[PDB]
Amino acid sequence: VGLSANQCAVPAKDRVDCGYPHVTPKECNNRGCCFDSRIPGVPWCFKPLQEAE
Numbered sequence: 081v082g083l084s085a086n087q088c089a090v091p092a093k094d095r096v097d098c099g100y101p102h103v104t105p106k107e108c109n110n111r112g113c114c115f116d117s118r119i120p121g122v123p124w125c126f127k128p129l130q131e132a133e
């Protein structure tokens with residue numbers, strides 16, 4: 081698995097959108113991003129935490 085659980089534990093308020101409305105989980109995965117639909121009204125597809133570039 082590429083992204084770890086800890087990389088995707090991003091508080092809702094800090095999430096940076098990596099997708100767009102109605103983006104699918106697979107599209108999100110294919111961008112190297114985190115998917116979470118549990119919390120409404122915040123990005124469901126968001127950038128992971130990782131070491132900086």
Ligand SMILES: CC(=O)N[C@H]1[C@@H](O[C@@H]2[C@H](O)[C@@H](O)[C@H](O)O[C@@H]2CO)O[C@H](CO)[C@@H](O)[C@@H]1O
Nearest residue numbers: 097099100101102103120121122123124125
């Ligand atoms: C209000 C908000 O931040 N919306 C996000 C979020 O949208 C989800 C989903 O993709 C939509 O189809 C649905 O209608 O609303 C969801 C949120 O409740 O996530 C997407 C993807 O990250 C963002 O582009 C939206 O801006």
